[PDB]
């Protein structure tokens, strides 16, 4: 679809068997998500945005469905405003920024 | 044009009489720009991103022309790594997400 940026392009995501509202977030290296129990092994990391660097657990090959949209790959969980698919996911479905 | 996510979507923009390099961000509500000096009259803000929130000086009514489009609203300035393009402006622009 094409999404207008009026309003926060938020859209549900299902991760772990579970549905999620997730913003799209062009300026997101990496997709962070909230606090949550995902199945697999996890590796304490760190990454930084605006307002600093925060402690995240880094999960690798995760499902996750975009809008209806597969994808599979890494991540992030810790102590976020928001659900955030970054680059990495956005990638993986064809997203591109049209104007 | 159509920009993909393979890399950091960055592009030039004119603010204040100078050309920078900024980031396309939609899941920004508001536009960060780097420390700059900025005439006119500001009042003091806090916005909070990944890790916290900053102190920020709004300016309002600033003309921002982003690769070529014309473009003029609310920008904040304050100690941010990278420029950053918001919705505010991105609105403007006709920019839209697309998969
Ligand atoms: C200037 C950023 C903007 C003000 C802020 N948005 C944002 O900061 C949103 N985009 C993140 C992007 O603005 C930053 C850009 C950046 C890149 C490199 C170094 C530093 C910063 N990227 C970024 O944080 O990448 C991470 C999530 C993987 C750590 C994510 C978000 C959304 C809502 C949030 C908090 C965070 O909370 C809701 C309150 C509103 N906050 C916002 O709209």
Redesign the interface.
Known sequence: ??????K??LVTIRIGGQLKEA???????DT?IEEMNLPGKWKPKM????????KVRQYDQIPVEI?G?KAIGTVLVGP??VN?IG?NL??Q???????
């Open positions: 679809p094409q999404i207008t940026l009026w926060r392009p913003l799209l977030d062009t300026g997101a290296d962070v990454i930084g945005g605006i307002g600093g660097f925060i809008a949209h976020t405003p955030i680059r956005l990638t479905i064809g997203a591109t920024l049209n104007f």
